[PDB]
Input
Amino acid sequence: TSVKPIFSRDMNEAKRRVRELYRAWYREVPNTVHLFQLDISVKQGRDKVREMFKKNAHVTDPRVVDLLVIKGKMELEETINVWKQRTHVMRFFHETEAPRPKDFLSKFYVGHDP
Amino acid sequence: ASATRLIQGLRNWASGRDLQAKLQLRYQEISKRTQPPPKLPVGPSHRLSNNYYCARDGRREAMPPSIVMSSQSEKKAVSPAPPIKRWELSQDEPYL
Amino acid sequence: LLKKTTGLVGLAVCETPHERLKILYTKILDVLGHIPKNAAYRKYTEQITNEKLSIVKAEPDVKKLEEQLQGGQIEEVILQAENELSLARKMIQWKPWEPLVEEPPASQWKWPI
Amino acid sequence: EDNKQFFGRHRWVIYTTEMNGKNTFWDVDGSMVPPEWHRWLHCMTDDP
Amino acid sequence: SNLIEVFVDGQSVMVEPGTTVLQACEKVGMQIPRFCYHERLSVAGNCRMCLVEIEKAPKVVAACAMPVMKGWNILTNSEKTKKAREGVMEFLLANHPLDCPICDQGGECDLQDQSMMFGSDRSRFLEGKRAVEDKNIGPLVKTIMTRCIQCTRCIRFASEIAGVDDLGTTGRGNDMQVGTYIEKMFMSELSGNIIDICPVGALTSKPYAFTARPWETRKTESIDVMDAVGSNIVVSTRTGEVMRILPRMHEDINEEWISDKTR
Amino acid sequence: TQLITVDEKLDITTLTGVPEEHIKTRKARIFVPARNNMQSGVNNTKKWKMEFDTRERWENPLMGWASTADPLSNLVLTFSTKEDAIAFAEKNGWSYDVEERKVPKPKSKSYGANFSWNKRTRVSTK
Amino acid sequence: EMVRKCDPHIGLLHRGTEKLIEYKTYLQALPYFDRLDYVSMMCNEQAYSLAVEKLLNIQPPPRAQWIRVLFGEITRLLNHIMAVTTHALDIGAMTPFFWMFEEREKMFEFYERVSGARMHAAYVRPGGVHQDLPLGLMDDIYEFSKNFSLRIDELEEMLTNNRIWRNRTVDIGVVTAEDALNYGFSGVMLRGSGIQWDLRKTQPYDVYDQVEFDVPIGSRGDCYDRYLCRVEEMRQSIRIISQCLNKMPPGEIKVDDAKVSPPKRAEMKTSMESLIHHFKLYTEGYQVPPGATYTAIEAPKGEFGVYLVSDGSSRPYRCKIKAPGFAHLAGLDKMSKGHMLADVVAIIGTQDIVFGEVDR
Amino acid sequence: TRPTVRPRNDVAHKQLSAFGEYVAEILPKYVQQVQVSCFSELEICIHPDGVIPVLTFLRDHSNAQFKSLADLTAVDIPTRQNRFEIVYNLLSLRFNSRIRVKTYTDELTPVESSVSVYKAANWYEREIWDMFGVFFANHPDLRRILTDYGFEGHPFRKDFPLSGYVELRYDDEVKRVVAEPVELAQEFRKFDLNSPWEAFPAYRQPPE
Amino acid sequence: GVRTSPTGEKVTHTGQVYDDEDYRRVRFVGRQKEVNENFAIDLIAEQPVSQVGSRVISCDGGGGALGHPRVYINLDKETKTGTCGYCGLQFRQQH
Amino acid sequence: TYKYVNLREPSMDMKSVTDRAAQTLLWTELIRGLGMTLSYLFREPATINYPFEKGPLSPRFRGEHALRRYPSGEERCIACKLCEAVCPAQAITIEAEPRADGSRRTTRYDIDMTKCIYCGFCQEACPVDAIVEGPNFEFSTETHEELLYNKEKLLNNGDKWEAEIAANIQADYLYR
Ligand code: SF4
Ligand code: SF4
Ligand code: SF4
Ligand code: SF4
Ligand code: FES
Ligand SMILES: [K+]
Ligand SMILES: [Zn+2]
Output
């Protein structure tokens, strides 16, 4: 049960790193909308950043959220630098995908998937 | 090969070499496109006796790696091999 | 005879190879004296360093010293002496003559699974 | 044939002007060669 | 306990008295090659593929039938054991037809698999092969008796488990032919498990005939519903279509068999 | 100290990049595969497996091929023990069931039983 | 003008080759190696073949080994033509490209005569080669090699003494020996800096201990000495091809272990063991004993190593492909510092980079 | 066993067994196993805390001088609780020899970066991060090297499917290459090719 | 021996033909359905039955190594001929 | 066993110094390069006249696939699925059943020619010489699905190219 830390000794330093990564994304989103000339607003991109951070809001393991912060900083460095194109930024917005059936009844109608 | 001797001489002069001796266009000195049928030889295992497969089974003589040390004197400090012999300079053409 | 070049790029010609190798071998021995005597790194490194230093002291020539140290040019023998010196300084800090820090899991190095 | 040419020029085909209905006076085609001549032309054999 | 001590390649193992050499090798995780042996049939002892060496003994013994004696070192990977296996595989493949591509047992053939594992790699047979006459024993079991190796798993199954006593060998010598001797139709309720316990393609499934091939099938482990026995089965599918139904070995229900309706 | 104490459950599902559809709606199956009753060999029945539920395979309109939308349809993982497979399923958020290893019971084989005096186990032929 | 930092973004030709190898047998995973270094096809075939033959504890016959060394040096000629001529075409000398690709067309005809495909032969296999040489092939290899020296002579006339070629190469891309060892360089990237190391001499494979050739050692570690090393390696490959045509033995071309290499179709259609072995080799394949190996050969770009792992089955558990271009393109960042943007394309030329082996 | 069996090299086997004893007794703090394969390739199995001491020793000791990093590799083996097997392939140019240093980590324990020992590893362990998810602490520029820029998941892990989870097509509505979930027109046919008969008795694992 | 469905479509040697209500006939609209009009099931019935004087005959399809693997065919049935499993040539014992 | 490329010391006598300065000021090696380029100007080019002239090929050549027949009209493929088991691209899809006279023949023999890697493992795994990879390479199409061959296309390629494929197998089969 004694493991080796990655960056965070406990959850509080990990939450500090999550918080600074969220600050850096919140600052970066207007420049991302500008220089990629995305057709979305700044509020929509920031709400997508909030959606991606709250997708991982259930983790209580410091090493796992350390690796999540490492991968998020990697995506941030790929976005600050122009390494992604417009396609790699807009893959966070599943625009061309049709909305999946949510309730039981429409999934029963269209197919076999639970 | 069809070139006149004036063009051939100018060409040999401009390159500085004799070019008809070594032509990069191939002619009738190459092999025939239709060949006589081969009779290929067989291996050493094509025998009718003293040819049990167990005495030439290559795959079944590989053993697992011999564990030298595991966690479950004035002996000589060793190297992985003898040190490499220094290369000799070429007696053919060393550019020296 | 003053070898013109080593042939290796970036490995400059040493003008005084014997004195340099004596300095580096005795400095390896001085650094290595801080390691405990029961460590196999100290015994083996004192062995090979005493052999190299005895060969260097027992040979005034440079070419014959290269052929009997058996490590190529004399300048890369000097470079490996520098590498051994820096290594022994690191082995003092790491202390790897201690026992194993952790046994592996019970089926860790088992192949095939 | 012209066996004085170099190896690659020494065999060729002058295609017809009508194959399977199509006007091939200018629209020659590499796949107009039938399989009995496709060995000879591609030098898979020395025998026509 | 009255367990006696035997040795399998020098490794000690405690077995009950009356245990065969094959089961004593099975306890250490070693599967001896076999063709006539089947642990739910009786012991025939005639394919002679389990010929293993007991050391300090100048004769190989039939491991499916020989009971162990206390103190035997069963040499499973010795030289004369391997020579016995290569010789017996050579005689098995002497008259065996070159049908491996057109055969439904290919890819799931014991004769192919342990010819690769235990046999030699080439033929000294420079003669003519036999061609055995085919039979018709029903619309379920395709019969190609040239591929038969005369292992009598047919006959032991129909005698002991199906309880039919209508399959048997006719003839003597190399002309010995497993069959019914007459135009008789082997229709039991268990008549399809002879397709399972034929190690070769001499008894193949006639509905599954030519349709698929065992490397590309996806083995799905399911339950029979044709009867209330609850027979554990494999449903094997190829590209989303059901190709056949094989049994699963479950000791408490259907030991390794299924019925003809299930199959 | 250079070591930390984490008493939480090992969960890496936010790190594997698998979408939620192929995490929470798939059923892993931990099992030793049954012996092919076509054959007598038991070397394939040695290790534990992990496959998933078979999702839909439909027909290609052009060629009649087996089209799929399931990425985990060809995924079969090989494990040495049952508990390693259970740990790998719990680590990746996969719901699993476990079928136990079905070893065949040892048989009392007797060649002399085929030629008994008063028992029903006489063979009528050999 | 100067270059401060060079960041090669790669993975644009990442195909996931060595994951696709995990789901295919060893014979099916052989043609993945033709397409890694796609100008050094039979050399990568030979490296994978030697890895599987080391794990299988078998050896090729002598004639198969001599055919492997013959076509390996034909392959080395092909790769150094590609290297030198495109390194000249990127700088601007477009003419010896066209001059040497006709000789390269003749060597692709040699591949097509021996295997049927002009580039990706799938010919050098574990156990030997797939098929014997057709009659009349070695005479045409002789007629090629007898003339190819004049081609190297006129290439070396166009470029070596040329002052514009020397201006673009002499003060360019200098690597010291310890940095070349530390960056994991291999082949000409080592030997231009003076490191006397060649895997055909030090750790020899198939019959390279029985052939006699020289190893061109650079003096300054720059682009120009590595250019001269590749030209002299073409000279020495002509030397090895002459020795291989003269010392070719007769005999078989596969291993005569029919549980590894497939039997002949004449006896596949006659014998029973041969038909069973043909069936099981072309559906299941041969099983490899469990073990991991690292077999490295001297590719014409450097050290083409394969870390192949077997679990005992007929498919590779893990198959790592070490390629020279990966470490060379990693060393691009140090080699380009202190140079201009015109020198970077020359450094990417003298590091013979094929991105199929860089990205897999 | 002459023509078709590989000749056994007993000399190099004995030399590598001696050098494996040498490394195992100089560095007992980290070396767990030493083994030499039958085709004479030495393997040093270490603890993941000894990446820098073992590799610095092999790079700098006068009886090792492994100045060249040939290859650096991870191997996903899911049945182990430390599923990744980080493999270092070294080359001695002085002693004309190769050594294999092997270690392990799971998804959450970082391996110490060996770029301070071998600068060749700066893209190799970057590839190990990209393909397997093994984090390398105290690395200069750790980022993805082979995958697509928005690519989620680690591909050479064995729980990752052959085709991925998303595929690309061009979409004329948004005028952009888009990512949608993968749907194959023909599914990859899985072939159960393993024989049920034991191939090699020397590799027979003992039963339970 | 190709026949034709009521939809005007040629039937393959397998027996495949699309239905009238099947939309997949639109791929042949303006184009052609390429079938092979040399049905092998008709071209092997045109072969003569080989009257051999032996009880067991061998067949390799002709050519030796250019045919199929050599099989041995039993001819003890006088009700039925002995058909080669690969090439389909059928044999009869001439007594 | 090694040689030093570019380890020549230049001479420093006035003869060689004036030779190098004349090479510098009078551009002598540049005139050498112009002379070599002029020497190729007066050669015959290696250009064949395609499509009227064709590149030289061998009987081993691996081009378009074809399903063959026996000399009786009977097709050779006995549905054994070795070719799709060995196919490293999984380009081959086979389905089979007994036909009306009970013979083991295919109903589906597809080859996705856009998956196919043209390596000829199918023709060397085929025990009956049914699938061959014939000599046709000029089969470029204008639609993607035209390169998705079914059994009828491959049987028509066999019936089209049999008069050439048979002679290539006749020329090559003793090497196999
Ligand atoms: S029974 Fe087995 S060995 Fe005999 S033809 Fe069928 S697959 Fe081949
Ligand atoms: S048909 Fe099969 S099961 Fe019956 S005796 Fe012959 S080989 Fe054995
Ligand atoms: S040539 Fe190769 S890829 Fe193409 S169908 Fe044949 S086996 Fe498959
Ligand atoms: S290998 Fe030959 S006979 Fe077998 S299925 Fe393929 S084409 Fe048909
Ligand atoms: S298994 Fe014992 S003889 Fe058949
Ligand atoms: K059967
Ligand atoms: Zn026939």
In short: The longest helix of chain B spans residues 5-15.
